[PDB]
Ligand binder design. Structure first.
Ligand SMILES: *[C@@H]1O[C@H](CO)[C@@H](O[C@@H]2O[C@H](CO)[C@@H](O[C@@H]3O[C@H](CO[C@H]4O[C@H](CO)[C@@H](O)[C@H](O[C@H]5O[C@H](CO)[C@@H](O)[C@H](O)[C@@H]5O[C@H]5O[C@H](CO)[C@@H](O)[C@H](O)[C@@H]5O)[C@@H]4O)[C@@H](O)[C@H](O[C@H]4O[C@H](CO)[C@@H](O)[C@H](O)[C@@H]4O[C@H]4O[C@H](CO)[C@@H](O)[C@H](O)[C@@H]4O)[C@@H]3O)[C@H](O)[C@H]2NC(C)=O)[C@H](O)[C@H]1NC(C)=O
Ligand SMILES: Cc1nnn(Cc2cc(C(F)(F)F)ccc2/C=C/C(=O)N2C[C@@H]3CN(C(=O)c4ccc(S(N)(=O)=O)cc4F)C[C@H]3C2)n1
Ligand SMILES: [Ca+2]
Ligand SMILES: [Ca+2]
Ligand SMILES: [Cl-]
Ligand SMILES: [K+]
Ligand code: NA
Ligand SMILES: [Zn+2]
Length: 805
């Protein structure tokens, strides 16, 4: 109940929200059906429209008008945004040359430049180039300010997850808004776009920017707008708040537009009907900038123009139906559309089996336009599994397609020509970023970055300490003229041991054999120097990784590679090696095929054994440094050390062997040498973080050798590819992957074919940032380079996406 008979007199768009049943006058009252009776009359005035005209100049103030053109309007802060243009011969902001804003030029009483976030729903990245003729105000912000060619949204590329990610710096799995539609089984409650459940505070985790600001003494405008408040009114409201007295005036504001998304759904991303929505958005920006200029705030405010996701072509005919695959289709609940999430219709049905559902959906039609996954098997780059609101079974849908349960769903719900929600690497899902103001750089283009990073920067813009989040703070310092955040590298927690030769061959009873009993003073000092680290500067180019947790490990040096060997996990945490452009691939010689050699630096007690692998009918082994790339027949013996061995399913060995035999050499030839760091990852609880030993769910049968869930590689070279990787004077280039360590290749529908037809495609799917690997291993890479730390942070957040232009 709301006692709707209080009044909004003097209260219009109040910043503090009042408690039921006292009636509300805030920008969300409409959404709750709680506005006072006179809200429309007093707060949503429309009389005479939104622009001054020649005859309205110097009028007698009429309080009924939507905005004002009387002499006193500037001091009242409620002029139409074109007042000075029409009535005082001023130029529109867009018609002024741009001029570097070196320092904030603010009215007296401003403690810090205000931040205005101008957010646009569905604004695809290519609209900046493709709509440029019709968006002069936006183009001026873009060319005069700082801009990225695009900004990567989070998955799923829907509105609710992405706007809340912008607000919090968190992945959807951590903030809890994991789709536009959700069932939380602990609450037994559903979140929907239409309706009231979504207003309950229990859905919304982390700490959004407006709360971070308020907790630290920085006042915030209310971020959310009721759909029926027109855009012109939202802008006028912001401009009115900017005219408040110093003690009342917010420092951070958001505008939100439902366009161009609303139209993109109806007409597709480039429908001819899309020109008008873009024009209209540009006019809104024009009104804000003209309004700021009137208040002498146009060289004081930092403006961020940002989208939540892009828009793809999708029609009703491009729908796959689960009824074409599943006999039991009525025992499931599907969250449908541009992703799928499946659970049991009833938790009382004991005959429901996710294993048989996955199998019935796997590689069943030649051109199948979705791929099923257990959520823990989704590419790690999506960070989309550690939340009870995410269903165990997930369908990754091809761009341009929909999934639905039954045909009746689609025609008893062609309406739409656009949609979004697909994998966040998809080019059509990319969105925009422009920053303009005293704190942003002047006429600067920056590389593409992920929207998880912006919370930190918005905190920096407002002098706030960010709540803990998934950004890497400092990785976007290159956007900023000042207020940069200068982090220190994390402190190493565990130092390595450097073991020498301490064990005799005969102390090892591992059930391993090697054909190697084949016998010089020139070449004996040589192998000794290699074991003491004499080639370490060739294979460990950026320093050894730092171990950021408590553990026992050894550094092992070799001619061709260096490793950090874990005594707890009985394998390397990392293995580092450089392959020059000139390097030769050799084969594993016949006598060495099943060779595993004891490592005399490492106790039998801290070693793997061959017998465990023989006994484990499911599990085989591979090597982290590939024997194929040994520098010499003598150096090849090192690659067969039991300390270079890791557990591998035979199906995974197909993948790994092709990467090591073919792909590494290929990249070295293309990139002018590469440095490779490879290793295992253990993430049995799918939280994106390194497991402790007591989290491991699988061991090689009858041993304490833990089985990795994934294998990573980080492949680094010179950005200037005219310089070899080992003699690089400037910025670096990286690509990485986190491959799932799976006992089958069901993920790859063409896997019966030659590895040259499917392996590289799999690797591309599981592309990763270095930072993803850091979270998953507790390691910190690139500790010793000549480069600035912020530059290295940017490098660690880089994702190689394998999408064309
Ligand atoms: C992305 O960045 C984020 C933010 O930094 C990273 O997320 C953090 O990860 C930490 C490690 O997993 C985690 O720390 C835990 O905090 C627990 C206290 O939690 C509450 O308080 C915080 C602070 O206010 C709050 O943010 C939390 O909010 C979460 O949960 C609510 C539900 O109430 C949601 O509304 C909200 O969306 C958010 O959900 C997410 O996090 C939880 C886990 O916390 C997930 O389950 C959800 O799916 C969702 O993703 C909380 O309200 C604290 O209890 C934990 O301590 C246990 O574990 C340690 C290990 O050190 C152990 O020593 C302790 O004894 C303790 O164990 C005991 O409890 C166990 C569980 O019941 C039990 O098994 C044991 O036997 C013990 O008795 C832990 O310290 C932190 O909360 C989150 N924060 C957020 C916001 O998500 C994230 O890791 C980054 N991602 C990547 C890939 O890097
Ligand atoms: C969600 C959410 N989380 N946090 N916010 C507040 C917010 C943050 C930021 C920013 F960038 F600064 F973080 C900027 C602006 C804001 C403020 C935003 C705001 O007033 N809204 C966003 C809501 C979305 N909405 C819909 O009905 C809707 C649902 C789905 C789709 S779809 N098909 O595209 O998926 C489109 C839609 F329009 C009601 C809008 C009112 N909204
Ligand atoms: Ca949206
Ligand atoms: Ca984990
Ligand atoms: Cl959803
Ligand atoms: K075996
Ligand atoms: Na297959
Ligand atoms: Zn949409």
């Amino acid at each position: 109940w709301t006692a709707t008979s209080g009044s909004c007199k003097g209260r219009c768009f109040e910043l503090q929200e009042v408690g039921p049943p006292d009636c509300r006058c805030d920008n969300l009252c409409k959404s709750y059906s709680s506005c006072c009776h006179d809200f429309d009359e007093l707060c949503l005035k429309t009389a005479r429209g939104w622009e001054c005209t020649k005859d309205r100049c110097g009028e007698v103030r009429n309080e009924e008008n939507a905005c004002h053109c009387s002499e006193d309007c500037l001091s009242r802060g409620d002029c139409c945004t074109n007042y000075q243009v029409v009535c005082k011969g001023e130029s529109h902001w867009v018609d002024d040359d741009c001029e570097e804003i070196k320092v904030p030029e603010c009215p007296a009483g401003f403690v810090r430049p205000p931040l205005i976030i101008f957010s646009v729903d569905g604004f695809r990245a290519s609209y900046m180039k493709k709509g440029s003729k019709v968006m002069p105000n936006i183009e001026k912000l873009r060319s005069c300010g700082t801009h990225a060619p695009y900004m990567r949204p989070v998955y799923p590329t829907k509105t609710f997850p992405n706007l809340y990610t912008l607000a919090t710096g968190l992945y959807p799995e951590s903030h809890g808004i994991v789709g536009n539609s959700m069932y939380d089984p602990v609450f037994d409650a559903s979140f929907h776009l239409r309706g009231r459940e979504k207003f309950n505070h229990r859905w919304w985790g982390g700490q959004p920017l407006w709360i971070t600001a308020t907790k630290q003494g920085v006042r915030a405008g209310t971020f959310f707008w009721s759909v029926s408040i027109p855009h012109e009114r939202r802008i006028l409201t912001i401009l009115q708040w900017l005219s408040l007295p110093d003690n009342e005036r917010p420092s951070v504001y958001a505008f939100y537009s439902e366009q161009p998304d609303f139209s993109g759904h109806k007409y597709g991303p480039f429908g001819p009907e899309m020109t008008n929505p873009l024009r209209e958005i540009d006019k809104t920006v024009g009104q804000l900038m003209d309004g700021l200029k009137q208040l002498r705030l146009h060289r004081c405010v930092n403006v961020i123009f940002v989208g939540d996701h892009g828009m793809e072509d999708v029609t009703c005919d491009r729908t796959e139906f689960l009824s074409n695959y599943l006999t039991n289709v009525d025992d499931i609940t599907l969250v449908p559309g541009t992703l799928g999430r499946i659970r049991a219709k009833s938790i009382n049905n004991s005959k429901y089996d996710p294993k048989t559902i996955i199998a019935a959906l796997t590689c069943k039609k030649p051109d199948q336009h979705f791929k099923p996954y257990m959520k823990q098997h989704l590419p790690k780059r999506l960070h989309y599994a550690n939340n009870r609101r995410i269903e165990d079974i997930h369908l990754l849908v091809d761009r341009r397609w929909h999934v639905a349960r039954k045909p009746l769903d689609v025609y008893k719900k062609c309406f739409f020509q656009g949609d979004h929600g697909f994998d966040n690497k998809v080019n059509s899902m990319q969105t925009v970023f422009v920053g303009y103001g005293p704190t942003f750089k002047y006429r600067t283009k920056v590389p593409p970055f992920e929207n998880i990073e912006l919370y930190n920067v918005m905190c920096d813009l407002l002098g706030l300490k960010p709540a803990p989040n998934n950004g890497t703070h400092g990785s976007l310092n290159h956007l900023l003229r000042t207020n940069t955040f200068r982090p220190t590298m994390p402190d190493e927690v565990s130092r390595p041991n450097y073991p020498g030769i301490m064990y005799l061959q005969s102390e090892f009873d591992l059930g391993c054999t090697c054909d190697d009993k084949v016998e010089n003073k020139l070449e004996e000092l040589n192998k000794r120097l290699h074991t003491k680290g004499s080639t370490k500067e060739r294979h460990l180019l950026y320093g050894r990784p730092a171990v950021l947790y408590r553990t026992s490990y050894d550094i092992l040096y070799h001619t061709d590679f260096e490793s950090g060997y874990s005594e707890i996990f009985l394998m390397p945490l990392w293995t580092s090696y450089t392959i020059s452009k000139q390097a030769e691939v050799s084969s594993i010689p016949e006598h060495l095929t099943n060779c595993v050699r004891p490592d005399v630096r490492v106790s039998p007690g801290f070693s793997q054994n061959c017998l465990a692998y023989k006994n484990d009918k499911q599990m085989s082994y591979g090597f982290l440094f590939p024997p194929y790339l040994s520098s010499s027949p003598e150096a090849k013996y090192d690659a067969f050390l039991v300390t270079n061995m890791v557990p591998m399913y035979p199906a995974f060995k197909r993948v790994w062997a092709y990467f090591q035999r073919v792909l590494v050499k290929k990249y070295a030839s293309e990139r002018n040498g590469v440095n490779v760091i490879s290793g295992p990852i253990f993430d049995y609880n799918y939280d994106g973080l390194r497991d402790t030993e007591d989290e491991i769910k699988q061991y090689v049968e009858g041993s304490s050798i833990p089985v990795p869930t994934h294998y990573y590689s980080i492949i680094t070279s010179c950005l200037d590819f005219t310089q070899p990787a080992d003699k690089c004077d400037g910025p670096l280039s990286v690509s990485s992957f986190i491959l799932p360590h799976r006992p089958d290749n069901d993920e790859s529908c063409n896997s019966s074919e030659d590895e040259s037809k499917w392996v590289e495609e799999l690797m591309k799917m599981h592309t990763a940032r270095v930072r993803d690997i850091e979270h998953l291993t507790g390691l910190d890479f690139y500790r010793k380079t000549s480069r600035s730390y912020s530059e290295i942070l940017t490098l660690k957040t880089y994702l190689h996406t394998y999408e064309s232009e």
